[PDB]
Structure formats: structure tokens, C-alpha cells
Symmetry: D2
């Protein structure tokens, strides 16, 4: 007659599978920022963590667990073995180590993806690890999931940084500053000037020289600052964490709560802008409980299409040379 | 005109003084976990960050700012200068660099020295703020914050046993298969190794565990519930061994205190306060008891009936702390 | 091609079922208060409303729908026909008359409960309609559900009001004021004085007269004022809504997110306190994804135990005369 | 000693002036919906309720207070006397009672003549958020009676109109209303203007994709989406007898920008003199930046000639009513 048995009468031991489980793969600075943002948004009833460094993994798990009083996620687990990830709705891959980088990371996915698939055959994959557009393709390929269930973080953070910088210029909350950065994540991303607006007032229409060499106000600087800010953050603190974690949590929210909000994420663009290769790039997608159910067909200028087409060529050039 | 002027007509450019500003001093692992938890709880309309390492400081600020789309804290600032902290309602001190293997005395003297410059700068720019001390040793450093600031007792709060208690309830919830929220239990006194678990208060739904199980908390306990408090101490060392530091649990616990304070909730939390006049304690020491927290900081405290042995452990901590504190120079 | 097909490319069209659906039966003052609170707590991805008054029902649905921009519940439906309630995790019954009260609400349930079960066989039932302890038994009896999946709102509001009044006297937030009102909802509930505490400090130990007539401070009136308050709110306002909505939403949060928090709700207490009859009364219960998995065995004084057994006799006396 | 004093030692006997206080004037269906939504969004540390029906007011206060355990707003107060409203940051006016119009007007002006001065006396530094109808006119009336600068007098205006529109838009497109952008401006209600040029998803102009958007020759008749916005309002009233939830939610959204100084852009009613050839003191909805000082800025929407003419017509009609009011 334990104290537990004296205190509590059990009606059923009928344990059941977690209903809204999320797994993060890789407990580096990016993965843990994703984890804490996810925990604080009450998106999962069970959170699983996986990594190859066993000590760091257990220690992060316990540190999260010790915050359980202040959370609404009743079960947090971790392990190197992927059985802990079983029955995840969403699995978020951040594992890496900050063309060498590709095959290096391709070998890693060859282990991770099949294990993820093994234990959550019907999950959505959200790839954050870089190069994210290539690695989203790699995951799509290895897992054999339909295109809707393999999502890259893509230009989600790029766009968010853009909207912050735009809001600073205008003196307006980023929520009310709209603008899309599409295509290849990072250096070669495309700011779609035609979609930039506040309250439906297109900045292109008011300012027809927007984002061109002529522009007297040099709004191209804003997109340049998006990439410059990324290098400056790494220069200053060594890594990026908070912003990517907050943006991934926002994607997870749409997926887990089947919101059908639209986000700039990396999806297979074969069939658009004259691209015929099996490659992934960022366009606005509708996110929900089976991942990317729909995408928005943004009208690009000839110069913008050309930039996406060049990225798709560069990326297929790397991908045809890959060993699976 | 410029594009901004063509787009937006300005009605006025007046005023602009923060209504719910929080400052965090020290942007290490603890500081930044406090910052992100505070931001995701929509507690502040402005967050200020302060450190001595200028590069790190600026990059941490930027990193938070780039997540602005996903938050409702419209202004994040940072700087080595305390002018960025002006008009803070709450100022959280997580500065000092964590202990290696170094001792308490070495930690004490280095962090006392750090506070001698931090605290007056905080007081200058935010004379009416509540101060929340997290840096270790927390009970001593809360005293130090109080002595230097000249603040009344209600506005100097030490994180104290708030994390100890959170871990205790976590562990208690594990053994019982109940959410920590519904497992009640208080760890009081000196933060860390010497903390006191108050067995008589441990309950679920108002049912005293001690009443059900009289051996609870004793050596004669066949179920060794006394290990639950031991594991609170053990789990802390273990986390530090495994990942090198602690961040998430302390950050979450601190954001909870900040919530009570900023929203004037008058919830009861176990935090360190100036305890002179209780438990036959006569010296100026800060220890954790259950404190009502709100917009004036600690407005009231709960008088917990302690056992002879629990009273003795607190008095012992008070004697030891004061022994250190009398030999400090200001 | 339509504008939609011009703007949006579909990957997959097949309609997925809701992951976290809740139904509210009865769109009166209580039902809609439950709904708004549930909606502002982000507990459901689908909300279904049912009533017999078709106009009021449609209008209430539309009114919620028109607030969709400010919510995170992407689908809101209504109907007199229970097919709109299909696949609910949780079904909350607030339909009824605001002995005669019993028989006529029993006749309503003979139609409601089978229809609920038909379309959501694995749902948790949460009963709010009065008299709640009797009607919870009625719902259990008719549904054929196991007892863990039939939950009466019970003493959850009574305890919430008790903690509010306690907080006012002590000048402490009700969250930090702990105290349990158990047994039969309403006039015959039992305040468990031994459990009343702040920070683990027993009020009864500090103030032995607590809950007796000898008490100079009349702490016994705190429990009486719980009952007086209910009647007073009705006199002043005509009904109660907000408090009960909020309390139901809190129960729903533990159920839907599997929190395993303890709440005072109505459950089958046969086998406890000498009770032999098939009756439902409030004890502290652990709430999660399977409804009530466990029960806290509160130590009650001789008088408290007898008060509970008395209620059980009274409730069975009524129950045995009912026609199903 | 008392139980409280044996349990609790007091360090200071309080009490600060209220720091994040909101008052709601009028505890009808709309005001109580505003109240619950504000409470569930943790926007205030003190909520004050005012009305002229004593019993109802006291009963609503108690009902809310009884849910305190589940809220984070530690002080909820009410009264017919406006001393209970002292030091509010934001005062929300939903007083009047449900419906001619000029009847509703001069009737509600008589009400405002008592309400507004009382509000001003106890919170001279508050922002006013007017919800009561006709909202554009009644926002003008609160502005004039108060003597407040125009930045602190905000009308709910076309906020609800724009949210209904976005709901309808999202229903058509199979997208969440958050990702469906579109603005309904001008006079709240029957005469509101859908700005077809701003209507977009992901910055893709639906007008650019479909130049017939919002026109008569539109083969998909997207004009009906605006008509449905107005038809929706009549339908709700017919079906349930009043509107509450949606307006409450939208108002709470405005309160959040204001109390948290977010500087988000919302379609609210503001003094529009000097724009679109409007020369009178009239309040019409345009996109406004909302923060701790109310409306600090407004967005200059480029309107078609027909859009501008509709705003001008509302302005003339509104001014013609306003000029005749007795204060
Ligand atoms: N798409 C975007 O917007 C962003 C992408 N990223 C990417 O996130 C990735 C990680 O970033 P950091 O956390 O800063 O690196 P990190 O070095 O701090 O952490 C990486 C983690 O991956 C783990 N790991 C390595 N191999 C593994 C394996 N086979 N299985 C499981 N875990 C394994 C490591 O143990 C380590 O904990 C990088 O690829 C980085 O480029 C970074 C931020 C922005
Ligand atoms: N009370 C509790 O339960 C706590 C649980 C965890 C940690 N607690 C303490 O937080 C502090 C800080 O922990 P952390 O892990 O964040 O230390 P770091 O070394 O990583 O970071 C410290 C920062 O402190 C900064 N620092 C250092 N000096 C200064 C000055 N003079 N002003 C401002 N900031 C300063 C320094 O640059 C670092 O950025 C340490 O005393 C821990 O024992 C206490
Ligand atoms: N358990 C608690 O703590 C409670 C606190 C407050 C209310 N409690 C009870 O909720 C119910 C409902 O109270 P409410 O104030 O909401 O009554 P209303 O009259 O406003 O609404 C009842 C609705 O119930 C509808 N109704 C009536 N019959 C039906 C059927 N057969 N199916 C569906 N809906 C039905 C009817 O049309 C109304 O719309 C009643 O038994 C109250 O005693 C008890
Ligand atoms: N702007 C929008 O989009 C709105 C959409 C919905 C409704 N909107 C208006 O809110 C108000 C109130 O609507 P509601 O439906 O709540 O009317 P009620 O009759 O139920 O409530 C009115 C309350 O107003 C009170 N009242 C009446 N007079 C007073 C005075 N003088 N002081 C304080 N309170 C007063 C009265 O006693 C009632 O309690 C009305 O003008 C509606 O057209 C506007
Ligand atoms: O923000 C980051 N930091 C990384 C980076 C920064 C500059 S180039 C790559 C990065 C690099 C190394 C380590 C690390 O943790 C992150 C990884 C990454 O993809 C990003 S987002 C980014 C990067 C470049 C341009 C624009 C953007 Cl929006
Ligand atoms: O959890 C922690 N980690 C620290 C620690 C852990 C064991 S002893 C001190 C710590 C130590 C060293 C570096 C560092 O960053 C933190 C600092 C600290 O106070 C705590 S909380 C703690 C510590 C000991 C016993 C019980 C508790 Cl609830
Ligand atoms: O608070 C209420 N109001 C009702 C009531 C009130 C007095 S007796 C029954 C009620 C009555 C009529 C309409 C309605 O919506 C609710 C229904 C009900 O159960 C409650 S809770 C209650 C009722 C009596 C004593 C104690 C409590 Cl905690
Ligand atoms: O939604 C409502 N209901 C009211 C209404 C409806 C049709 S005309 C006025 C209304 C009317 C009567 C009573 C009442 O409580 C509300 C009050 C009101 O302003 C609105 S919003 C509205 C009204 C007309 C067209 C478009 C909109 Cl977005």
C-alpha cells in the first residue's frame, strides 16, 4: 500500500499514444530555441528530442522538464534511439554542425530520415538544417513521402527579418508590414517588390522605382540588410537561435492547429517559372494538418523568374551529383 | 516627399515613455532564457538588455529583434550604458558569470564587486523599479542589492527557492502521475544545497501526504520520499555536468515571478526576502518564505508553521549567511 | 480558370478529419459562454454547436464565425442534426431548463445522448445541465460509456467561487488560495475545511474554530456565500454565464491537452464513503485525454462522509423512479 | 488576532493608482462581450464596468469575479458612479441600447452628454474607444464633448466590417482570414467601401490577377462579398436579435494594440478632415496606427475616383446630421 495507492484510486491504466506529438532532431542552439518556443506556445502534448551527443541531450531534456510547472506539455522525452520519437505528427530536423557541407550532411540524413520514417511513418517533416532547400529535397527523396509532407523552413526567417527591417523604416509593427522574400534561402533570395504593402497600399504603385538601381531611397538596401544582418549576428554572438526558433514555432502552429495560414516555405517548384528539375524553393504555401496542401502562384517579373530559374539550375547541378 | 511620408500621415510625434518596461542585466544563458520567456508571455512593452560584452550583447538583441513578427513586445533595446534601462518597472539581475571549480567566497566577492557598479546605475535610471535578483549566491546577493540600492524591503526580491520548489513539484508529479500544478509543496530557506522541504505542506487536493504517511520526510520512510528533496539538489548538479549550465527552467520560473509582479496578481511564490523578525532570526538576512507578489514587489508574506528541525535549518542558514555578510565592505 | 485556381495551386484536395474537435450542445447563456472561452483558449481545431432553436443557433454560429480573424479555430459549424458533431473529442451538454426539472431534462437526454454517441463514439462527455449530478448519471446510463468518459461539471464552479471568496478575505489571488467543495453540486455541497490552505499552511490547524458556529470570524459563511452568490447572481442578472463558461473551458483544457490536473468534478463514487448506489458526486479527479483516469481519495471527517452518503441516498431515491 | 493576521505578515498597506486599467461603459451584449474578450487576453490589471441599470451591472460584475481563478485580471469593479473608472488608460463606450437613426443619434447624444464629461473628469488622460451606433457620428460627438485631441478619440468604425469581409474572403479561398488581406473603409455599416485594389493574399493583388474584381461585369461577382458583409449584419440580428461575439473580439484586438503600444494598423474611425476633398469635421475609417497614444498616424490609401466619391458622400450626409445636433 504505497502512498500513491493511499492517495489515488486508479480507474484505468489504459495508456494511449500521444495525440499531438512533436519531435526535434538536434539539440543545438537552433533546435533548443525551436523547442522552447514550441513549449511556450502550447503546441504539443509530448515533446521528443534526439541527438548523437548523449550527455548534452539528457541535460537539455532535464532542464526543460524542470520548467514543467510553467508549461502545458505534460511529457518530455529524449534519446539517441528513435523509438522515443514514435507517433510524432511533426518532426523538426535541425541536426548539422553550422558542396563540402552538402554530402557531409547528406550522409547524416541517410541515418536520420529512415529512422524518423520507421517510427512516425505518417508525420510531417520540417527541415531547418542548411542548405535547407537542398536538404529538403534530400529528405523528400530518402523518406519517399508525398511532396506535401516535406517542408523546408526556406525563406520564413528571411521574410520575417525583412518585415522587421521594413517596420523599422516605416515606424509600423512588422505584423502590419507585408512583404515576401522568395526563392532560394539565404544569399540568393528574391525580394518580391510588387507584394510589399501596408494596408493593401502597394509600395511599388506609390514608388514605381522601388527596388531598382534608380530608386532615390534605395529600398534594395532592406533586402541587402536581410543577408547582412545574418552574417552580422553570427559575427557578434557566434550563432543564430532566437529568431529561427520563433519562426519555426509559428510554422508548427499552422501545421498542428490546421490553420491554413500562408507562409514562405520551401516546396518542390517543378512546373513553375519554367523549372523542370526536382528541386525545392520558397513560395507562399498554405500550411495545415497534412503539411503543404496548396501553394500561392505569385506573379513574378521576368527578372524575378530568371533569378529563381538560376537558383533551380545551381541546385540541380549539385543534386544530380549526389549519392543516395 | 519620401516613401514613408507619401504612405503615412503623422498626427503627432509626442511623448513615448514605456509603460511596462523590463530590463535584464547579464545576457548569458540565464539572462537570455529569462528574456525569451518574458517575451513569449507578453509581459513587457519594452525589453532592455545590458552586459559588459558588447559584441554578444548586440547580437543577442538583434536575434530577438528579428523575431519581432512573432512577438508583441514592440521595442527591444540594449547597451553597456544604463540609459537604455530608464523607467523600468522591473529589473532582473543575472549578471556575474557562473561558478566553475570555484567556491562560494570567490563567487561572493567577485559578484559583490560587480553589483557595486550595477545597482547604483539601475537605481539612477529606474528609481521606482522592483529589483529581482537571480545571480548566485542568490540570498547573499539579494541582501547586497538591498544594502546598496537603499530600496524598501518590498522592492528587492531574490529568485531564492522558486526554482528549487518548481523542481520539487516536477519530481513530485512524476512519482504521483499528476501534473506539477496540482502537486503542492514548498521548499524554503536558503537557495540550493541547504534548502528546506516543508513536509507538512505537501499535498494534492488539500490531502496532506504527511497525514496519510506519517514517516514521510524521515529516515524511517520505506518509500524514501526524502529522496525527492535530495534529487532536487542532485538534479541541479547533474544538469550542470551534462550540458554545462542551466537556463530553461530558471528562465521559465523567473518569467512566472515577472508575471505576478507586472500584472499585480498577488499570487504566493517562494522567493527570498528580508526575514529579520521571524524564526528567532535577528540579523539582516534574506531567506525564502512564501511571499505575495504584485506591483509593489513583496507586499506580504505567509507565516509558515515550521517543525523544530525545519526552524533549526533556517536559523543555521541565517547564522551562516550573516557570518559572511558582516565581513563584506560597502 | 477561376480566380481561386489562378491564385492557388492545389497539391491535394482530400478533406482531413478534425484532430481536436469539441461540440457544445445548447446555445443558451451557458453554452455560448463555454464556446467563447473555449475559442479564446485555442483548445479546438473544430467547434460544433447544436440546438433545437434553429434561428438562434444559426445566428450564434455566424456571430462566432465573424470573429474568426481574431481566433485560431479554423472551422465553426452548427446544426439541429448531430452529423455536424461527428468525430468530437469532447462533447459538452448545456441543454436544459434554467423533480420536474429532472424528468423533463431526462426526456431531452433520451434524444440528445444517443445522437451524440452515434456520431462520436469515443468522445468524452462533459455534462453541465442541471441537476448536474443526476443528469451525469443519466448520460452515463444512456450512453453505455465507461465511467471515465462521463464527467459532470459538478463542484468545479462551487470550488472556483469558494476560492474567489477566500481570496477576497485573505487578499490573495484565488490561484494561491486552496480549498475544495465536494459532494453534491449546489445547496448540499460540502466544504472540506481540513484542506483549506495557503502555501501549505492549514487554516484549520491555525484556527480550530474554522467551519463551526463557534467561529468569531464566521469562516463558515464563505461556504454559505458560495450558495447565496449563485442565487444573488440570478436575482440581479437573470442567469449565470461567464463564471461557468470559464470553469468549463479549464476542464476542457486538461482533457484536450492531457494535463492530468486535479479538478473537483462529478464522477461515479460507488465504492467510496460507504456508498453503494450508482450515483455521481464531486471528488478531486485527475483529468486527461481519457477523461477521469484517477480519483483522489480525500480523507473526510465522520460528518463529511455522512453528508456525502446522505446526498447519494437522496439522489438515488430520485434516480430509481426515472423512466429511460 | 484575526486568521488573516496570523497567516500573513504585511510589509505595506498598498496601494498604487491603477496602472493598466480599462473601463467598459454599458454592460449590454456588446459591452459584456468586449469585457470577456479583454479579460481572456490579459490586457488590463483592472477592469471597471459602468451602466445605469444597477441590478444588471452588479450581477455581471459578480459573474465575472466568480471566474477570477481562471483569469489574470485581479481587480474587477463596477458602479453607476464614475469614480470607479478613475485613472483608466482606455475607456470603451458601448452604451445606448440597440436601435430611425437620427432617433438613435439624438437619443444617444443625450446619453453621451452625461457619460463623456464623467469619463473625462476621472480619466482626463484616457483614450476613448467608441463602439455605440451610429459609430462615426457618435465618435465625433465624444470628440467634441470631451475636448480631447483627435488622436485619443477612436471609433470602432470599419474594424468589424473588415473582419467580416476577411472571414468571407477566407471562406471563398480556403485560406485563414489572417492571410486574406482586404480593407473596408469609410462609413461603418451600410455605406462602407471595399477597397478592391488592396485585396490580396501573399501580396498577390487579386485585382491585378482579375481586373474585373469588384466590378459589375465580374463573372465571379466578388462584389457580393461586400454585400454579404452588410447582409451578414442584418441576418445575425434577424436570427439572434443582436450581435456580440464578433464585435467584442474585434474591440479586444484594438485594445491590445493600444494597451501594448503595438503600432499595428487597423481600420478605425478617425477625424478625416483634409483628405479626399473632405472639408468637414467628420470621422471615417481609414487604416490607422494604434499605440499607447491612440491614433498616432494614418495610412494614405490611394482611392479610385468612385471610392473617393463614396467617402465624400458619407462625409456630407454625416456632417448634415452633425450640424443639427444640440450639445
Ligand atoms: N533555414 C534557416 O533559416 C536557418 C538554418 N539553420 C541551420 O540549423 C543547423 C544547426 O544550427 P546550430 O544549432 O546553430 O548548430 P549546432 O552545432 O549548435 O547544433 C547541431 C546539433 O546537431 C547535432 N547532430 C549532428 N549530427 C547529428 C545526427 N547524425 N543525429 C542527430 N543529431 C546530430 C549535434 O549534436 C548538435 O547538437 C545548421 O545547419 C544551420 O545552418 C540555422 C539558422 C537559420
Ligand atoms: N537562483 C537560481 O535558482 C539560479 C539558477 C541558475 C543560475 N543562477 C545564476 O545566474 C548567474 C548567471 O548564470 P549564467 O549561466 O547565465 O552565467 P553566464 O556566465 O553564462 O553569463 C553571465 C553574464 O554576466 C555578464 N556580466 C558579467 N559582468 C557584468 C557586469 N559588471 N554588468 C553586466 N553584466 C555582466 C557576463 O558578461 C555574462 O554575459 C549565475 O550566478 C548563476 O548561478 C541562479
Ligand atoms: N453545473 C453548473 O455549475 C451550472 C451553472 C449554470 C447553469 N447550469 C445549467 O446550465 C443549463 C443551461 O442554462 P442556460 O442559462 O444556458 O439556459 P438557456 O435557457 O439560456 O439555454 C438553454 C438552451 O438549451 C436549448 N435546448 C433545449 N432543449 C434542447 C435540446 N433537446 N437539444 C439541444 N438544445 C436544447 C435551448 O433551446 C436553449 O438554447 C441549465 O440547466 C442550468 O441550470 C448549471
Ligand atoms: N461599431 C460596430 O461595429 C458595432 C456592432 C454591434 C453593435 N454596436 C453598438 O453597440 C451598442 C450596444 O449594443 P447592445 O447590443 O449591447 O445594446 P444593449 O441594449 O444590449 O446594451 C446597452 C447598454 O447600455 C446601457 N446604457 C444605456 N444608457 C446608459 C448610460 N447613460 N450610461 C451607461 N450605460 C447606459 C444599457 O443599460 C444597456 O445595458 C449599440 O449602439 C450597437 O449598435 C456597434
Ligand atoms: O541566420 C543565419 N545564420 C547562418 C548564416 C549566416 C550568414 S550565412 C549563414 C549561420 C551560419 C553559421 C552558423 C549558424 O549558427 C548560422 C545560417 C542561416 O541560413 C541564417 S538565415 C540567412 C543567412 C544568410 C542570408 C540570409 C538569411 Cl535570412
Ligand atoms: O541549477 C542550478 N545550477 C547552478 C548550480 C547547480 C548545482 S550547484 C549550483 C549552476 C552551477 C554552475 C554553473 C551554472 O551556470 C549554474 C546554480 C544554481 O543555483 C542552480 S539551482 C540549485 C542548485 C543546487 C541545489 C538545488 C538547486 Cl534548485
Ligand atoms: O450559479 C448557478 N446558477 C443556477 C442556480 C442559482 C441558484 S440555484 C441554481 C442558475 C439558475 C437559473 C439560471 C442559470 O443560468 C443558473 C444554476 C447553478 O447550478 C449555479 S451554481 C450554484 C447554485 C446554487 C448553489 C451553489 C452554486 Cl455554486
Ligand atoms: O452587426 C451589426 N449589427 C447592428 C446592425 C445590423 C444591421 S444594421 C445595424 C445592430 C442592429 C440592431 C441591434 C444590434 O444589437 C446591432 C449594428 C451594427 O453596426 C452592426 S455591424 C454592420 C451593420 C451593417 C452593415 C455592415 C456591418 Cl459590418
Amino acid at each position: 500500500a504505497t502512498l500513491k495507492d493511499q492517495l489515488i484510486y486508479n480507474l484505468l491504466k489504459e495508456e494511449q499514444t500521444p495525440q499531438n506529438k512533436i519531435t526535434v532532431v538536434g539539440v543545438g542552439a537552433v533546435g533548443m530555441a525551436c523547442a522552447i518556443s514550441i513549449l511556450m506556445k502550447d503546441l504539443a502534448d509530448e515533446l521528443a528530442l534526439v541527438d548523437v551527443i548523449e550527455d548534452k541531450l539528457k541535460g537539455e531534456m532535464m532542464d526543460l522538464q524542470h520548467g514543467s510547472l510553467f508549461l502545458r506539455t505534460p511529457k518530455i522525452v529524449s534519446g539517441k534511439d528513435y523509438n522515443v520519437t514514435a507517433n510524432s505528427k511533426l518532426v523538426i530536423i535541425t541536426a548539422g554542425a553550422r558542396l563540402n557541407l552538402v554530402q557531409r550532411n547528406v550522409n547524416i540524413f541517410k541515418f536520420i530520415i529512415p529512422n524518423v520514417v520507421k517510427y512516425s511513418p505518417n508525420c510531417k517533416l520540417l527541415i531547418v538544417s542548411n542548405p535547407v532547400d537542398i536538404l529538403t529535397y534530400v529528405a523528400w527523396k530518402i523518406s519517399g513521402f508525398p511532396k506535401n509532407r516535406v517542408i523546408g523552413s526556406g525563406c520564413n526567417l528571411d521574410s520575417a527579418r525583412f518585415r522587421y527591417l521594413m517596420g523599422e523604416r516605416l515606424g509600423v509593427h512588422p505584423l502590419s508590414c507585408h512583404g515576401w522574400v522568395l526563392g532560394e534561402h539565404g544569399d540568393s533570395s528574391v525580394p518580391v517588390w510588387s507584394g510589399m504593402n501596408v494596408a493593401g497600399v502597394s509600395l511599388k504603385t506609390l514608388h514605381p522605382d522601388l527596388g531598382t538601381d534608380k530608386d532615390k531611397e534605395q529600398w534594395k538596401e532592406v533586402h541587402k540588410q536581410v543577408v547582412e544582418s545574418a552574417y552580422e549576428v553570427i559575427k557578434l554572438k557566434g550563432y543564430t537561435s532566437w529568431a529561427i526558433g520563433l519562426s519555426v514555432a509559428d510554422l508548427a502552429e499552422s501545421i498542428m492547429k490546421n490553420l491554413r495560414r500562408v507562409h514562405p516555405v520551401s516546396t518542390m517548384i517543378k512546373g513553375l517559372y519554367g523549372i523542370k528539375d526536382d528541386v525545392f524553393l520558397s513560395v507562399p504555401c498554405i500550411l495545415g494538418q497534412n503539411g503543404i496542401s496548396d501553394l500561392v502562384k505569385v506573379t513574378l517579373t521576368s527578372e524575378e523568374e530568371a533569378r529563381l530559374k538560376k537558383s533551380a539550375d545551381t541546385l540541380w547541378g549539385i543534386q544530380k551529383e549526389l549519392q543516395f
